[PDB]
Scaffold this active site. Structure first.
Site, mmCIF file in Angstrom:
data_model
loop_
_atom_site.group_PDB
_atom_site.id
_atom_site.type_symbol
_atom_site.label_atom_id
_atom_site.label_comp_id
_atom_site.label_asym_id
_atom_site.label_seq_id
_atom_site.Cartn_x
_atom_site.Cartn_y
_atom_site.Cartn_z
ATOM 1 N N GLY A 19 2.481 6.430 8.974
ATOM 2 C CA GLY A 19 3.898 7.166 8.677
ATOM 3 C C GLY A 19 4.895 6.153 9.197
ATOM 4 N N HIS B 84 0.903 -1.287 -0.044
ATOM 5 C CA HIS B 84 -0.067 -0.111 -0.046
ATOM 6 C C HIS B 84 0.762 1.271 -0.043
ATOM 7 C CE1 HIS B 84 0.300 -0.614 4.579
ATOM 8 N NE2 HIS B 84 0.507 1.002 4.281
ATOM 9 N N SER C 72 4.177 2.593 8.214
ATOM 10 C CA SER C 72 3.787 1.675 7.024
ATOM 11 C C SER C 72 5.190 1.067 6.410
ATOM 12 C CB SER C 72 2.773 1.773 6.308
ATOM 13 O OG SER C 72 1.515 1.764 6.852
ATOM 14 N N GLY C 73 5.417 -0.095 6.133
ATOM 15 C CA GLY C 73 6.318 -0.520 5.413
ATOM 16 C C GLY C 73 7.667 -0.771 6.122
ATOM 17 N N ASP D 243 0.219 -7.767 1.685
ATOM 18 C CA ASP D 243 0.603 -6.312 1.675
ATOM 19 C C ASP D 243 2.247 -6.563 1.783
ATOM 20 O OD1 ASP D 243 0.745 -3.737 1.830
ATOM 21 O OD2 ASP D 243 0.003 -3.605 3.797
#
Ligand SMILES: [Ca+2]
Lengths: 223, 58
Positions: free
Chosen positions: A175, A40, A177-178, A84
């Site tokens: 902020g 995402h 995410s990932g 994801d």
């Protein structure tokens, strides 16, 4: 990261920031030319920033490298959030030193109770907004599949896991995410989603990296 | 003028910090907000121009 602490300059050398004119997602360096992040977080024009601590000030150890390819998992479902995960190839290889280093992929999945380290430059408030300059860290345990499913009925797949505290107050947030979830020196998760941040009975949900190891290795080798 | 233009901005459950635009009927203009990266609602645009073109005047 809500309820965490200041990591300390370059103490999480595999942490990267994905920048599109501003920091929007985190990621983890898995080799000199590849980064793993969340699907995402896919955007065009990504610049990967390595060796960062204070993301608003050039401190001297940074490496800014543009992405040449962004490969989203072929089975990513934007509705259910299943699969994801995304791989980003750097246009040129990064220079690995003590402040910029890769993180190993896992050889086996982690079990409930394992303590992990989650990091990022995301929001530090559960209610309100406060984005930090420096990298924040949080130690949190992986939770059982049973508890994760009770917290998010019908939303947890075999490719997700919960981590955090049921009492709330400590979690990943917008902020982050990932970004990485590292347990015993291995990358076990990627910051994905949750019901708000740091809310009671709603721990964060992460992509279960151990289920994608073969896909990651083969994809990196064929691109 | 659509109804979706009058809905409040929706960040969603994902944890990115992506800056998007939404039409704010109270102020009569497109404003920025933080979108988490997934499950966007319709009052969510990548630019002020797209937002004004779709929702301007609502
Ligand atoms: Ca910096």
């Amino acid at each position: 990261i809500v309820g965490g602490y200041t990591c300390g300059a370059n103490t999480v050398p595999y942490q990267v920031s994905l920048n599109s004119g501003y920091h929007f997602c985190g990621g983890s360096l898995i080799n000199s030319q590849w980064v793993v992040s969340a699907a995402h977080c896919y955007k065009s024009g990504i610049q990967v920033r390595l060796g960062e601590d204070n993301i608003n000030v050039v401190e001297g150890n940074e490496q800014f490298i543009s992405a040449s390819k962004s490969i989203v998992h072929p089975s990513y479902n934007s509705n259910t959030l299943n699969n994801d995960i995304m791989l980003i190839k750097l246009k040129s290889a990064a220079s690995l030193n003590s402040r910029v280093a890769s993180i190993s992929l896992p050889t086996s999945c982690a079990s409930a109770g394992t303590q992990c380290l989650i990091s990022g430059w995301g929001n530090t408030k559960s209610s309100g907004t406060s984005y930090p300059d420096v990298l924040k860290c949080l130690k949190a345990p992986i939770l059982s599949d049973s508890s994760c499913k009770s917290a998010y009925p019908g939303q947890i797949t075999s490719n997700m896991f919960c981590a955090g505290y049921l009492e709330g107050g400590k979690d990943s947030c917008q902020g982050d995410s990932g970004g990485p979830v590292v347990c015993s020196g291995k990358l076990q998760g990627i910051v994905s989603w949750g019901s708000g941040c740091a809310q009671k009975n709603k721990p964060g949900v992460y992509t279960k990296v151990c289920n994608y190891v073969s896909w990651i290795k083969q994809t990196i080798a064929s691109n | 003028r659509p109804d979706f233009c009058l809905e409040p901005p929706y960040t969603g459950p994902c944890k990115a910090r992506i800056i998007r635009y939404f039409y704010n009927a109270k102020a009569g203009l497109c404003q920025t907000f933080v979108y988490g990266g997934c499950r966007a609602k319709r009052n969510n645009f990548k630019s002020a121009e797209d937002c004004m073109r779709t929702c301007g005047g609502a």
